[PDB]
Amino acid sequence: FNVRLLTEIAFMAALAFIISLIPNTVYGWIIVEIACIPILLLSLRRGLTAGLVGGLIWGILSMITGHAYILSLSQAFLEYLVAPVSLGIAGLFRQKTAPLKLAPVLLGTFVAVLLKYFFHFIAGIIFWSQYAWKGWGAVAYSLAVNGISGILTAIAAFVILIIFVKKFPKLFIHSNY
Ligand SMILES: CCCCCCCCCO[C@@H]1O[C@H](CO)[C@@H](O)[C@H](O)[C@H]1O
Ligand SMILES: Cc1ncc(Cc2csc(CCO)c2C)c(N)n1
């Protein structure tokens, strides 16, 4: 692995972290998580592993800096290591060769945001039900909150990755030289 590779990885995690510090709350725990974007861009450009690891580092930064909501060991583990690591799955949709095509950017962005918010949804059932709206069971409450957060994060990720796909396509295609 290159010095170049590590550089990219570190930088994009620093970038997710810096972005996670922007107010992204729509209502209660419904968020638009734009900070996923640099990890997704990272996974698409350099593949799974690079992505899993950049997610890991983002999670660690959130926790060690105090910008993470932690209820217990296992909830911190599920939502600030597994969940951000899981965006690396987008790396399976990497395009090694030109021309760049939009479909795999969107299918990869979709599956990975979905995967991340699936973990939150599971987290939401186990650790967060004390906050459920009146009349709601926990599973329903977590689906609404994490389903909607999932969808809005994907929309944001799409808007942005689409402009990047249209204006700066070689971003998604690693190349030496
Ligand atoms: C899909 C995101 C989920 C967020 C759901 C909470 C609504 C956001 C705040 O707007 C609310 O919307 C209502 C309907 O228009 C208004 O009547 C009300 O005054 C207003 O406060
Ligand atoms: C119902 C409910 N409320 C809160 C959470 C916690 C959460 C959702 S997204 C995210 C990371 C973005 O900062 C966390 C910590 C959850 N999984 N379910």
- What residues does 25 pair with on adjacent strands? 31
* Resolution of the model in angstroms: 2.5
Number of H helices, E strands in the chain: 7, 2
User: In this structure, is the dihedral angle defined by the CA atoms of residues 117, 122, 128 and 133, taken in order, positive or negative?
Assistant: positive
Among all bound ligands, the one having the nearest atom to the CA of 119 is 2
Torsion of CA 170, 154, 43, 10, to 10 degrees: 100
Atom of ligand 1 nearest to the CA of 152: 1
Q: Is 79 in the pocket of ligand 2 (CB under 6 A)?
A: yes
Method: X-ray
Q: Whose CA is nearest to atom 11 of ligand 1?
A: 27
Distance CA 10, CA 139 (A): 36
Work out the end-to-end distance of the chain between its first and last CA atoms, rounded to an integer number of angstroms: 16
Distance CA 87, CA 53 (A): 10
Q: Output the six-digit token pair for 134.
A: 């009146």
Map out the domains of the chain with their CATH numbers: 1-177 (1.10.1760.20)
**41 contacts 174 by C-beta, under 8 angstroms:** no
Distance CA 77, CA 170 (A): 35
Among all bound ligands, the one having the nearest atom to the CA of 133 is 2
Q: Is 142 in the pocket of ligand 2 (CB under 6 A)?
A: yes
Q: Output the six-digit token pair for 138.
A: 């926990």
